[PDB]
Amino acid sequence: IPAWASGNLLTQAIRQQYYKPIDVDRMYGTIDSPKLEELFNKS
Amino acid sequence: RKFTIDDFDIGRPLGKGKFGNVYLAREKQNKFIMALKVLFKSQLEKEGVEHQLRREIEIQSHLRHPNILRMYNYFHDRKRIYLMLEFAPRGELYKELQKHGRFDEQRSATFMEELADALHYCHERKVIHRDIKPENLLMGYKGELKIADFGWSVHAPSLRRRTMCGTLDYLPPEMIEGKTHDEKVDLWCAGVLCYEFLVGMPPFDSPSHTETHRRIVNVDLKFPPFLSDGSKDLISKLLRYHPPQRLPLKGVMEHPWVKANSRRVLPPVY
C-alpha cells in the first residue's frame, strides 16, 4: 500500500480536502464523458 | 479530453463487489483522493444488467448534493468501466450501526435531517430512491450521511410505478399489496430507517417473510420503552399506511425532534 493511502498521510490529506475543496464541477464536470450509449462498445 | 486508468494512483481496495471492486485512488493531476469503482464489461453483459447500470449512472451522475455521494465522471477501456466517485472517509453506515448496536438521538436526528434534505433534492427532480436502508448509506469526513447506492432508483416524471423493489423490512404497504406507488415510498422507508437507527432492528422484524408482510400492512408498530416521545412522534408520522398522510420531507426537516437534536454541519464548498 502506497504511503499516501494509509494512516496519517491519508488522514491529513482527507482533512485538507474537506477544508479546501476543489472546484470539482469544473475540474471533472468539464471533462468529456463517454456517451452512456457507448459504454459497452469499442474504447 | 478524458480519463484513463493511468490518470490515477491506485491506493488500495475499499470494497469487494461482484461486478468489480472499488479502490481508494488519487487523481494525479490534482492529487485529489476519490474512489474508483471498476466494473467488468463482459460480466455486466453476461448478467444482462447493461441498461440497469446505464440508468443508475444517468441518475447518480446528475445529482449534486452534500448528502448524496457524488459521481464526478466516468470512463472505460477495453474490458472495464470506471466510475469516479466521491470518497466517504468514514465508510459504511451499516458497519457503524452494527458496531454501536443503536445510535443515540443526536446521531439519529442528524442523519434524518441529512437524509430528508437529500431525498427532497431527489424528489424535486422526480427521482424516487426506493431503497433507503443503512447499507446504502456512507459517511463523510465529519460523519455526514451520503446516499451512496441508487440501484432501485427511478426518474418518474409522471406515471406512478408498479415495480416491487427495495428490501424486505423496508417495503411499504403499497408495494406489498400490489398497488401502484409514487415518491411517498421514500417517506415510509425514512420512517423505518429512523426506527432502525434508534432501536438497532427494523420495526417489523419477523421469523418469516409472510409474517413481516403482515406486520407491515397492518403497520404493527411496537415502540420499545426507551424511545423518546419526540422520536416516536416522527416515526409514527412517517409510518402511515396511506401514502398521502405521511409526513413530507420538509416536515421531517422541521420536526421539533430533529430541530432539537440534529447537529448537522454542511461541508465547506469550493
Swiss-Prot record, chain A:
Subcellular location: Nucleus; Chromosome; Chromosome, Centromere; Cytoplasm, Cytoskeleton, Spindle
Role of this protein: Component of the chromosomal passenger complex (CPC), a complex that acts as a key regulator of mitosis. The CPC complex has essential functions at the centromere in ensuring correct chromosome alignment and segregation and is required for chromatin-induced microtubule stabilization and spindle assembly. Acts as a scaffold regulating CPC localization and activity.
Sequence similarity: Belongs to the INCENP family.
Domain note: The IN box mediates interaction with aurkb/aurora-B.
Subunit structure: Component of the CPC composed of survivin/birc5, incenp, cdca8/borealin and/or cdca9/dasra-A, and aurkb/aurora-B. Interacts (via C-terminus) with aurkb (via N-terminus and kinase domain). Interacts (via N-terminus) with birc5.1, birc5.2, cdca8 and cdca9. Interacts with mtus1.
Protein name, UniProt field: Inner centromere protein A
Organism of provenance: Xenopus laevis (African clawed frog)
First and last residues shown, out of full length: 798 to 840 of 873
Swiss-Prot record, chain B:
Catalytic reaction list: L-seryl-[protein] + ATP = O-phospho-L-seryl-[protein] + ADP + H(+); L-threonyl-[protein] + ATP = O-phospho-L-threonyl-[protein] + ADP + H(+)
PTM note: Phosphorylated, stimulates kinase activity.
Activity regulation description: Kinase activity is stimulated by both birc5/survivin-binding and cell-cycle specific phosphorylation.
Primary localization: nucleus
Keyword line: ATP-binding, Cell cycle, Cell division, Chromosome, Chromosome partition, Kinase, Magnesium, Metal-binding, Mitosis, Nucleotide-binding, Nucleus, Phosphoprotein, Serine/threonine-protein kinase, Transferase
EC annotation from Swiss-Prot or TrEMBL: 2.7.11.1
Co-factor requirement: Mg(2+)
Binding positions for ATP per the UniProt entry: L14, G15, K16, G17, K18, F19, G20, N21, V22, K37
Localization of this protein: Nucleus; Chromosome
Any one GO CC term of the record: kinetochore
Active site residues according to the UniProt entry: D131
Domain Protein kinase: 8-258
GO-annotated biological processes: cellular response to UV; cleavage furrow formation; midbody abscission; mitotic cytokinesis checkpoint signaling; mitotic spindle midzone assembly; mitotic spindle organization; negative regulation of B cell apoptotic process; negative regulation of cytokinesis
Keyword flag Protease: no
A Gene Ontology molecular function term of the record: metal ion binding
Function: Serine/threonine-protein kinase component of the chromosomal passenger complex (CPC), a complex that acts as a key regulator of mitosis. The CPC complex has essential functions at the centromere in ensuring correct chromosome alignment and segregation and is required for chromatin-induced microtubule stabilization and spindle assembly. Involved in the bipolar attachment of spindle microtubules to kinetochores and is a key regulator for the onset of cytokinesis during mitosis. Required for central/midzone spindle assembly and cleavage furrow formation.
Assembly information from the UniProt record: Component of the CPC at least composed of survivin/birc5, incenp, cdca8/borealin and/or cdca9/dasra-A, and aurkb/aurora-B. Interacts directly (via N-terminus and kinase domain) with incenp (via C terminus), and may weakly interact (via N-terminus) with birc5.1 to stabilize the complex. Interacts with mtus1.
Family listed: Belongs to the protein kinase superfamily. Ser/Thr protein kinase family. Aurora subfamily.
Protein name: Aurora kinase B-A
Portion of the full sequence shown: 86 to 355 of 361
